[PDB]
Design a protein around this ligand. Structure first.
Ligand SMILES: Cc1noc(COc2cc(Cl)cc(CC(=O)Nc3cnccc3C)c2)n1
Ligand SMILES: Cc1noc(COc2cc(Cl)cc(CC(=O)Nc3cnccc3C)c2)n1
Lengths: 304, 304
């Protein structure tokens, strides 16, 4: 028993982290096969971040202008290209530590582990969710750009995120591994609206199931509700509407606990309308939404 | 900016995880140099866990009775010994992936990363603290025994904890890497009192400094306090007494924010006496105590 924000083991990703320097700028790169991926703002100086013409800036760069360092050995760059907001540096050496990998674009509400890096060196690993407004609430500093988010399916690492930017609001924005930003963000020093962020209802419900599995049952009641009645409560509290797909996704957790999804929704409804009244659920005084039903099943079953 | 419960990169520890089988029982082992470390209750059956005579049970075992598997290759056991509550299986092959390591006994209030494992395979990594009552609030299942806790100082992994047991209260107990249990716990199926657990005051204060560094300043006030006045509030709320050593340990965070420790204590005093009033600090509705002043400095500075 016990329930924590558990990140994936980071080993397979640590072996892919390199350092990328372009002029004055140094950020992290991802070395997979003979290709290093990194945010394209590596070619920029502070002066041209207001409105950079990336194609024009890339033109003034050559293969030899991109310094790629793998721990201590210098990688030779034989190619460079821009794919959306990422630069792809073809190096003459395939990464001997390249794991089985995929590049996937995660859906908002899904979770992933982040290996925060500085100068191609990992500093820590934490679990987080792609918020419904496509921002992430991570922990990043100057130099963290190029740090990646991923998931692991047995031996296959699915790379989903590359950190590019901190917005003035303190939230983090980035791209998938093809360079497409999650959300409406642009890689330039300009005013950018993050958008209204709602709570991932299916994740809060899954975490309520984790609480029941882990002994915390104070919030369970003698009531039930309907999808349409629950959704009226969800709208008032800026919660994502619960669909039948979400109910089905919560099926394994419903079967494991013997608590119907709509009975759990009535517990959530009471918790939303009345609060915790000073009590805790799994050591938390607020409703947690960064655990998918999949994360709950995995953690409570012990999937390696 | 941003602040998360960040675990250490787990790679160096993943390369040390092996599977240990003794009869019907299978748990995790730690392979460092030519020695595999694992909880000694691996030699037990469910029938003798009520009051096991470990010396007597170990006598009925020979080197060939201990099955050590490193991923897929069988390790040959040429020695076995019991050191307190851990068994030390001398294998004929040194671990090629042995990192620079130390065995340390952490102090209560200190934090460490746990690589939760099942069948010698890592499933996840999370950060936690040794509670003042020497229990840990981790996430462990049947088979997780042998999972280790550690810290990393540049290239050196300091092993501090080995998971042995879940208590009926849901908390977790274990040993240092010499087999000495943290706390008054014994490795036997018997009634065991965890003891009153207090809040790590120096950690809550350090996390209040992380909040100020990360923009959350609503809780800062026009007041100050003394060590003796603050401690009267700490006792009433089951908080660890704050000493001058703790004030000194918070020195770097005091200098970085320009907020004197005793001014921060008066903010904590008001928060304890009045609560959050429905507000959050770093996304939390309760006072977090599993971040040492060291963890805060490391995360807010970007130490790799
Ligand atoms: C100086 C300067 N030059 O440009 C800027 C602002 O515009 C940008 C635009 C882009 Cl695409 C990227 C960046 C890097 C960044 O945001 N890093 C970062 C990430 N996560 C946490 C903290 C930090 C500092 C800055 N200031
Ligand atoms: C069956 C059975 N045999 O003994 C016992 C109870 O006594 C013990 C005594 C010891 Cl020293 C160790 C264990 C293993 C254990 O506690 N595992 C564990 C760890 N963390 C989370 C979940 C689990 C299940 C059981 N039941």
């Amino acid at each position: 028993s016990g329930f924590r924000k558990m990140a994936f083991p980071s080993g397979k990703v640590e072996g892919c982290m390199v350092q990328v320097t372009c002029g004055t700028t140094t950020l992290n790169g991802l070395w997979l096969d003979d290709v290093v991926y990194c945010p394209r703002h590596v070619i920029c100086t502070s002066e041209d971040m207001l409105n950079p013409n990336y194609e024009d800036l890339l033109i003034r760069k050559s293969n030899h202008n991109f310094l790629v360092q793998a721990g201590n050995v210098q990688l030779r760059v034989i190619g460079h290209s821009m794919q959306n907001c990422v630069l792809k540096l073809k190096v003459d050496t395939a990464n001997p530590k390249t794991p089985k990998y995929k590049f996937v674009r995660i859906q908002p509400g899904q979770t992933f582990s982040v290996l925060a890096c500085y100068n191609g060196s990992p500093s820590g690993v934490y679990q987080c969710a792609m918020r419904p407004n496509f921002t992430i609430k991570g922990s990043f500093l100057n130099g963290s750009c190029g740090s990646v988010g991923f998931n692991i399916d047995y031996d296959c690492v699915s790379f989903c995120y590359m950190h590019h930017m901190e917005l003035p609001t303190g939230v983090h924005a980035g791209t998938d591994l093809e360079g497409n930003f999650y959300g409406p963000f642009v890689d330039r020093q300009t005013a950018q609206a993050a958008g209204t962020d709602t709570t991932i209802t299916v994740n809060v419900l899954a975490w309520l199931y984790a609480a029941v599995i882990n002994g915390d049952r104070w919030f369970l009641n003698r009531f039930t509700t309907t999808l349409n009645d629950f959704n009226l409560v969800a709208m008032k509290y800026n919660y994502e509407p619960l669909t039948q797909d979400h109910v089905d996704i919560l099926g394994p957790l419903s079967a494991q606990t013997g608590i119907a999804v709509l009975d759990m929704c009535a517990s959530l409804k009471e918790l939303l309308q009345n609060g915790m009244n000073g009590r805790t659920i799994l050591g938390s005084a607020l409703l947690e939404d960064e655990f998918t039903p999949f994360d709950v099943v995995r953690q409570c079953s012990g999937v390696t």
